[PDB]
Design a protein around this nucleic acid. Structure first.
Ligand SMILES: [Ca+2]
Ligand SMILES: [Mg+2]
Ligand SMILES: [Mg+2]
Length: 430
DNA sequence: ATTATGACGCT
DNA sequence: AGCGTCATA
C-alpha cells in the first residue's frame, strides 16, 4: 500500500513528426500541400517504393512499403515526391537536416533523447516544477490545452470529435487539484501545457506539424502519442492505465511488437497488456528472463524506469544499399565500385559531422548480404577508421570482406551480394 | 524486389 | 567481437 511505488516520479513526452518526409517535401513544394501524396525511392521498379504517406492519401488505403504503381490503383490522383539520388543510391540528407531543425528547437525546452529521425523523448520533470512555481496555485485554463486529448475521458454523462475532445478535457480540468504541487496528475497537465508550447514553436519556426504523448515514462508517452494523430497530443495518466490496457493488444507496446510479444501471447495464452497483471514477477521471469520478466511485471501496471538519455546526435553514421533479385553484384569490379560510392557518401557525411559536432568516428563496420540468406545481414566485420578518406575506406572494406568470395576465379564474385553496408561508429571528442 | 537506416541485447 | 531483435522514414 504505502510502500508500492507507482511510477509517477517523472513527466516524459514523446514528440513525433506527422508523415515526416511528406511534410519536408510539402514545405518545399507548395503544390503538394493538402493533397494525397507520398514519398518514394527509386522509380523504375513498379514506380518506386513508398516510404511516407500523407493523411489524405492514407484515407484511400495507401501505405508505406507499397509500390507506387499499386498505390495509384487505390489513389489515381496520388502525388509523388522522389527521394534524391546521389552516387547511384538514395540520399536522405534533406530529411536528416530537417530533423536537426526540429531537434534543436525541442532542445530549447528540455533535454531530449533522439529516438529516430523524426521523434524525440523529452524529460519535462524539471521544466514542470519550474512552471508550477511561476503559476503559484493558478488553475489551468482549457485554453492552454487547445490540441490535447485526455485518454479515458469523457466518461459517464459530443456528436463531433472536437466536442468530445473538449468534454473530456473539461472533466479532467474540473477534477484537478492545483493546490498540490506534487500531484502527478497536475504535473502531467503542466507537462502538456509545455508540450503545446513546444509543438507551437516547432510549427511556427519550421512549418512542420507533429503529435505527442505525455505520460510518466517513455513507453506510455510513445503509446499516448499514437492515440490521436495527426496534429494532436494525448495525456495518459497513471489512472487511465487499467482501462487502456484492458483491451490493448500486447504488440502495441514498444518492444513487444516482434518475437518476444508473440511468445508472451503464446506462452501465457493472453491477448491484452492488462492480462499480464495476473502473473507474479517470478512467473514472468521464468518464461521471459530476469530482465524481461521484471520489465513486464512493472510495465503492465503502467510503470517503467528507462531514462530519457541526454543524446541529440546519432551514435553511428551509416550508408547502405540493397541489390535485389537480378541486380545482385557478381563481379569484383562491381563490388569495388559500389563500396566506393558508399564510402564517398560516408566520407561527406563524416566530414560534415566532424565540423558540426566536434567528434571523430574511430571504427568502420562492414556488412554484406549474400544471395539466399533471409537475414538482414549475412556477415559483419570491423576495421580501424583512421582517416576520413573514401578510397581508403572502400579499400579497407574490400579487404575485410574479400575472403567471402567463393568464386575460384579472381574476377568473378559468388555467391552474388544483395546488400552492402558501411557504418562509422565509436566516436571520440575532437 | 520495400529500402535505408539506427539503437541496443546476448554471448 | 559478431550476431540478433526491434524500431522508424
Ligand atoms: Ca512520424
Ligand atoms: Mg516516428
Ligand atoms: Mg510511422
Amino acid at each position: 500500500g504505502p510502500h508500492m511505488a507507482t511510477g509517477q516520479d517523472r513527466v516524459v513526452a514523446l514528440v513525433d513528426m506527422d508523415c515526416f518526409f511528406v511534410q519536408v517535401e510539402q514545405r518545399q513544394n507548395p503544390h503538394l500541400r493538402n493533397k494525397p501524396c507520398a514519398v518514394v525511392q527509386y522509380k523504375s521498379w513498379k514506380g518506386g517504393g513508398i516510404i511516407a504517406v500523407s493523411y489524405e492519401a492514407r484515407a484511400f488505403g495507401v501505405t508505406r512499403s507499397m509500390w507506387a504503381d499499386d498505390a495509384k490503383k487505390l489513389c489515381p490522383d496520388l502525388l509523388l515526391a522522389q527521394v534524391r539520388e546521389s552516387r547511384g543510391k538514395a540520399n536522405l540528407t534533406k530529411y536528416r537536416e530537417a530533423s536537426v531543425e526540429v531537434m534543436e528547437i525541442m532542445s530549447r525546452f528540455a533535454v531530449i533523447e533522439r529516438a529516430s529521425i523524426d521523434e524525440a523523448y523529452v524529460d519535462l520533470t524539471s521544466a514542470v516544477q519550474e512552471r508550477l512555481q511561476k503559476l503559484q496555485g493558478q488553475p489551468i485554463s482549457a485554453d492552454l490545452l487547445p490540441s490535447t486529448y485526455i485518454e479515458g475521458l469523457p466518461q459517464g454523462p459530443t456528436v463531433q470529435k472536437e466536442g468530445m475532445r473538449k468534454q473530456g478535457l473539461f472533466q479532467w480540468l474540473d477534477s484537478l487539484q492545483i493546490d498540490n504541487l506534487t500531484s502527478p496528475d497536475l504535473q502531467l497537465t503542466v507537462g502538456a501545457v509545455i508540450v503545446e508550447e513546444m509543438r507551437a514553436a516547432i510549427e511556427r519556426e519550421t512549418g512542420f506539424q507533429c503529435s505527442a504523448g505525455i505520460s510518466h515514462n517513455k513507453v506510455l508517452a510513445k503509446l499516448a502519442c499514437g492515440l490521436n494523430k495527426p496534429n494532436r497530443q494525448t495525456l495518459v495518466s497513471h489512472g487511465s492505465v487499467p482501462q487502456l490496457f484492458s483491451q490493448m493488444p500486447i504488440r502495441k507496446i514498444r518492444s513487444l511488437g516482434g518475437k518476444l510479444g508473440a511468445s508472451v501471447i503464446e506462452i501465457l495464452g493472453i491477448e491484452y497488456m492488462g492480462e499480464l497483471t495476473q502473473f507474479t514477477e517470478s512467473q514472468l521471469q521464468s518464461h521471459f528472463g530476469e530482465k524481461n520478466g521484471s520489465w513486464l511485471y512493472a510495465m503492465c501496471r503502467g510503470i517503467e524506469h528507462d531514462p530519457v538519455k541526454p543524446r541529440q546526435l546519432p551514435k553511428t553514421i551509416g550508408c547502405s544499399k540493397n541489390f535485389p533479385g537480378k541486380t545482385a553484384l557478381a563481379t569484383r569490379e562491381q563490388v569495388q565500385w559500389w563500396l566506393l560510392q558508399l564510402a564517398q557518401e560516408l566520407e561527406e557525411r563524416l566530414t560534415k559531422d566532424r565540423n558540426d559536432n566536434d567528434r571523430v568516428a574511430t571504427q568502420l563496420v562492414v556488412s554484406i548480404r549474400v544471395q539466399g540468406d533471409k537475414r538482414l545481414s549475412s556477415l559483419r566485420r570491423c576495421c580501424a577508421l583512421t582517416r576520413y578518406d573514401a578510397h581508403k575506406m572502400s579499400h579497407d572494406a574490400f579487404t575485410v570482406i574479400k575472403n567471402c568470395n567463393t568464386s575460384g576465379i579472381q574476377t568473378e564474385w559468388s555467391p552474388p551480394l544483395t546488400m552492402l553496408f558501411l557504418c562509422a561508429t565509436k566516436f571520440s571528442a575532437s
